[PDB]
Paper text:
The structure of PcGSTFuA3 was solved at high resolution (2.1 Å) from crystals having the P6122 space group with one polypeptide chain in the asymmetric unit. Structural superpositions of apo/holo PcGSTFuA1, PcGSTFuA2 and PcGSTFuA3 unambiguously showed that PcGSTFuA2 and PcGSTFuA3 are in the holo conformation in the conditions used. In PcGSTFuA3, three formate ions mimic the binding of the two GSH carboxylate groups and of the GSH thiolate group. A fourth formate molecule occupies the position of the sulphate ion in PcGSTFuA1. The distance plot, which compares holo PcGSTFuA1 and PcGSTFuA3, revealed a significant difference in the β1-α1 loop. It is linked to the low sequence identity between PcGSTFuA1 and PcGSTFuA3 in this region and to a one-residue shorter loop in PcGSTFuA3. The β1-α1 loop in PcGSTFuA3 is longer than that of almost all GSTs and reduces the solvent accessibility of the H-site as observed for β1-α1 loop in PcGSTFuA1. The V-shaped PcGSTFuA3 dimer is roughly 5° smaller than that observed in PcGSTFuA1. The consequence is an increase in the number of intermolecular hydrogen bonds from 5 (in PcGSTFuA1 dimer) to 12 (in PcGSTFuA3) leading to a more stable dimer. In the active site, Ser-22 (PcGSTFuA1 numbering), which catalyses the GSH addition on ITC in PcGSTFuA1, is present in PcGSTFuA2 but absent in PcGSTFuA3.
Glutathione transferases (GSTs; EC 2.5.1.18) constitute a large superfamily of multifunctional enzymes that are involved in phase II of xenobiotic detoxification by catalyzing the conjugation of glutathione (GSH) to a variety of electrophilic compounds. Most of the GSTs are dimeric proteins, each monomer harbouring two domains : a thioredoxin N-terminal domain containing the conserved GSH binding site (G site) and a more variable C-terminal α-helical domain (H site) usually involved in the binding of the GSH acceptor compound. The fungal specific class GSTFuA is particularly concerned by this expansion. As assumed in our recent report PcGSTFuA2, PcGSTFuA3 and PcGSTFuA1 share the same structure, which contains distinctive features when compared with canonical GST structure: (i) a new mode of dimerization, (ii) an original β-hairpin (β2’β2’’) that inhibits the formation of the regular GST dimer and acts as a lid over the G-site and (iii) a supplementary helix (α4’), between helices α4 and α5, that closes the presumed H-site.
Author numbering:
A (entry chain A), B (entry chain A): 2 to 251
Write the structure that this text describes.
Amino acid sequence: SLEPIIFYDIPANEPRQMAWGPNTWKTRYVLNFKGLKYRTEWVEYPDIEAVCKQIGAPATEKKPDGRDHYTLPVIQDPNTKAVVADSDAIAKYLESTYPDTPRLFPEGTRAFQHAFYQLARPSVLMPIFNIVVARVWKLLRPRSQEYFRATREQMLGKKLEEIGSEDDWNALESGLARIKSSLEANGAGKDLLLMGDRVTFADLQLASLFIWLRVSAGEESEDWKRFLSLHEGKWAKFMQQFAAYEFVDV
Amino acid sequence: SLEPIIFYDIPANEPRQMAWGPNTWKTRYVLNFKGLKYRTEWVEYPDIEAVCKQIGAPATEKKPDGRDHYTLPVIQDPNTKAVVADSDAIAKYLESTYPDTPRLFPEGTRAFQHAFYQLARPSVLMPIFNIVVARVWKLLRPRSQEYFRATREQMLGKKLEEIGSEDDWNALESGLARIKSSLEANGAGKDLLLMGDRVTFADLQLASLFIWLRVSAGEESEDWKRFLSLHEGKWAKFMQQFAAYEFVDV
């Protein structure tokens, strides 16, 4: 008797790529993993601010000029009238509001999980960004394309085509090497999940970076094939754990 | 009836500064916190390789030339004949070998703790290094001084006196800002320990960086006073939790 949660995500111009975002995938992973009923409302980049304002979703940050900056994912929960932005806030909301669903925040782990993503962001998200950003622009619909190109380039001071070198693959490998040695501190048979034998939001956050690569580059691309080869296939084994949680409603 | 564990540490030319090292303090904190009986064997920098070889302590890493590099802390446990190097390995050894002592590795936390120190090292250890490295050289005894200067400078390609600028305090503040926001994910009243209401090795690792600053710079220095002021005194409150675990046997 629960009404579907409305989940706001950014579409693409090809069905296989409809769900592509690294941050929106954090929320889709949580929704899927927790087994909550939802529907995706697909929102183009330049329409994000408008939709947020229209539903009372807060902005998640300020621009360099101090002006409000609105981002997805956002969810609207008809069952409680909650409207929540930012994937971390959304995860904790769902944990708290649907306590019967599978837990992603075991006690005493919230700082550790937060710190983990602070390590992953610069060392894994940033290299993957450089690797895929041109192909991201390519998979977006036209109104989204102009907004995306204009924003990212203004920030990067560089044409999108001029980003994405071999230095990025080196940096990615090094960041993953540190995550690999962290996982290994759990000991053999426990070294594919941060807590060894259960999934946390932090694991899904890492997976979100990986699936962003796979969807942007293409599951059959040389780039994805190269990723699956890193560290004797460890991240292939990592991602295989989350295959059942990748449903997209298109 | 337990015999004291022998703990190898690097001395200084002033009693207040005898225990100064960021890594050796990780082991001293663990020994103190766990309430284990120990004695410090004080070993000068150039004598570390010799002492290690003499007691069967392994090297913890290789130099750029691939040659073995021996470091302290090391412990020798007469009760089991164990000789263990590297502060992480030493902590886990003590956890495992003395299970009745206060726990520092709760289940499911080993990867999270490892990842946390990977975040702290570049963002907190490295800025503090730049800040104190000249005063570190200053507090060492003469044979240690030459070794320390020669090694660090060969690595830094810069005289020790030319290191330590305002950029370092900015970088330190930014690294601590990220750790601060991680701790705050635990919620109010739980935001001074990574797990909120218990101490882990990861907390002691952060404390080791802080006490290194305090001992190197001096508890009364402007630099230590400045550290205690950062973030409305949060790190002062953090360090106050570990005051009872700072016994030094000099």
